[PDB]
Amino acid sequence: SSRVIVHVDLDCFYAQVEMISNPELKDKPLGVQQKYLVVTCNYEARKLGVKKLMNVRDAKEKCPQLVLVNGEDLTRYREMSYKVTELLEEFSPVVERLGFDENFVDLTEMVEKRLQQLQSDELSAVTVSGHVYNNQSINLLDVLHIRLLVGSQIAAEMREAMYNQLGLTGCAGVASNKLLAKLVSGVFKPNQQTVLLPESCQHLIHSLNHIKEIPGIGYKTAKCLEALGINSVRDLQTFSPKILEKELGISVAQRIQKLSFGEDNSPVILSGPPQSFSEEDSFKKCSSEVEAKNKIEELLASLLNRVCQDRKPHTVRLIIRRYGRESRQCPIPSHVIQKDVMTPMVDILMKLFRNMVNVKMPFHLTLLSVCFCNLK
Template sequence: MELPEQQQQEEEEPDWLCPEPGGPGSHAAPARGSSAALGAQSGHGKTVPSGSTAHRVIVHIDLDCFYAQVEMIHNSELRDRPLGVQQKYLVVTCNYEARKLGIQKLMSVRDAKEKCPELVLVNGEDLTQYREMSYKVTELLEEFSPLVERLGFDENFVDITELVEKRLAQLQRDGCSKMSVSGHVYNNQTVNLHDVMHIRLVIGSQIAAEMREAMYNRLGLTGCAGVASNKLLSKLVSGTFKPNQQTVLLPESCQDLVGSLDHIRKVPGIGYKTTKRLELLGLSSVRDLQTFSPVILEKELGVSIAQHIQKLSYGEDDSPVASSGPPQSLSDEDSFKKCSSEVEVKKKMEELLANLLDRISKDGRKPHTIRLTIRKFSSTNKWFSRESRQCPIPSHVVQKFGTGSCDVVAPLVGILMKLFRKMIKVEMPFHLTLLSVCFSNLKALPSLAKGSIGFYLTRSSPPSSAGKKMEGVPQDQVNSCSFVQDGRIRNIRTRESSLETKSCTEEPEISLCPLHLLPAGIDQEVFSQLPEDIKEEIISDKTGERIHTKNVLSQPLPFSKGALPFFAQEQMHSTPNSRRADHSISSLSTGSS
């Protein structure tokens, strides 16, 4: 039987590459009755800028068995029964009733039914309801802070530093004398409310509890939370107690937490390929990496990577929580045992496009770049054999988006087949096991009044890329041999994997007027489609004199270069990165979450 292509993690996206934190071997214990006095000396008169990375308060929210929860919310009769969510031949996730009976994520359906005959299976191929619920969670968390960064469907980072500072100031004004921690304290450490960082984290634990309570009361969802001073640590500590619990990590226990990881591959941001290179150097534990010669490490990996991963091994992470915003790409893919004819390829492309065009229609933006990814069968290199090509979508095709899928499917399939033939010699036998189609470079429609020439010529600015997390672009899970993209079973890639991505050079060149001759905001591609007399009129309106456009429309439109379509970053921080893909994937291995 074919091995699973993805490690379950409830979505996409993801470029934050983390293993399951804590785990059964963790030596953390619940804090009992954690409370202490908050006196006048609580801050020792210190004032710390809220933007200081050393004094941030970050919450990592990880929803419990997300797909299964959504199914139980939609059908309450499933709540107390062992439930599994099936995609193809695998149980991609299951509820805790099923886990008690021995069902595990990514278990084959056959094995799961043998182990638990009473297991109820629901089809999870359609991700619509999961995607919609996921965005509701993110919107709810944004009520607490504008800095919310999605990590696939079921995980979010929230920077609550500013809210913590406000509450701390209010407590001091009110003369509050006592505070208590919500949830557990990692390692059962005693809270010192004469330590300003302890105070902030305690307040953070209370806010995290409010977030989880709001999720349950308003959406019916439960989840775990980790509260710490950076993203790496909050991610690691959030899974210490499961399900539906939370843990705060105080600074003094950071090294205990990082040291509890049983292998360097468990350090977020250290990928599969890098792990193999480190193992060749004799490194396997976090302690090995911490004490290894920086000079040798820099020689082997390069200065920036060497310094970065050694910082990670100490739990240091200064990457900000970047507000994700709308997806910067939308993709869908399908895996199969064999696809070996152009007819089959076209059929699968049409199926993927049908879903994507529906999502594009609901999104409201129009894509300007299309990418095709394939995976050829390989008995020796199964997990690292993806190849991609991308090219701009011609303007006349872009204009058809939103007018009816029938009008746009045929030209898109034609473009995809050109890209396909760049990678596959169709006259020779071929064996594919995956196809993926991605729309990117999404741009909003013009906001000018319809009817004005500016309405048709103005190009809207692309959405903010602050978070740059691409939902819909396969995200790399570097800590295992598989991961989940857009909630579906995918294979993994790493930053060091050789991924060939090229622009399509067969598209016709578009001659454009030099930018300095066009009024501000005019879209060159649309301008090039206008009749010559209208072009000349537009230019003359700016320059005050008539210019024959045939003499100036000679600058070719530079096609976009084939940027890597996968977020194979081995840095644990998500900026800069893509963001946001409805990538339809997180690709984090969340273990039992």
């Protein structure tokens, strides 16, 4: 029937993890730097012009007093990421990750259990925790309203637990599907939560200013819709189903058009241990086989540290970039799957390397990544 989903979204995640490590950064404007980029900054610096993924020189040209911290190494953020997911998994076991700082949790069964605990007395004392989207009025006789309020109380417990137990703040959105939870969780930022009652749903989706803002509609699909005279959510709502299939495929079409009406029936899928783990690095230039081999050696070494834990990988891939992506994989021989070990691994990779780049020709590499997948 009607679900109750929460979407949890950590405030300035990398910045926030750095500030926890020393508050000498907190209260001071702060950017987290990767290569020539500040990828994220604290709010104490966001109001001073600093934007996410902003060029590091333009970031100084709007704030020369910002503290820069190098967050090229994801290790600490990743460990924090799973601590968050695991805490949420305590509430209900089916938690879906999206990147390092977002989780969906299906609160439906939990919402039911709590209501069954209540008497017909306390069913009228129930209150909302956090903002109601659009200041819509609650109607306690509306059983959908009552379930969504209970969901907002659970969302508040989640947020409180994350803070008491891990020191992290985040936003939460409670709604009836995954699309809507995610759209509404950002209505009040940072460190706040908002709940979407059913009658405000159209208000929510029409609140958007371009189709590119609908999660599921990425870089290419946007540029495609934009080339059919489709700019607004309503343009996509009202556009012809038949034509739309012809440019995107009956799959993309019928899904994104449904999204345009705030409709999303995709289940919250339990993420669990990952399906892959890699190590990446980019650079301005790399046109040798010795340079490449050396970079590749570092990536494998860090990867190998992570390769312990839960279980073992039975495939390896190598990714390069030109001047887009090009990969080459192959499986990892039996005896190799026992944890030197670098030596034959480096050989596999370099053979994979040579397979895809002419090592006696000019070649200009701007990225290198080593991936372990197919985990058993």
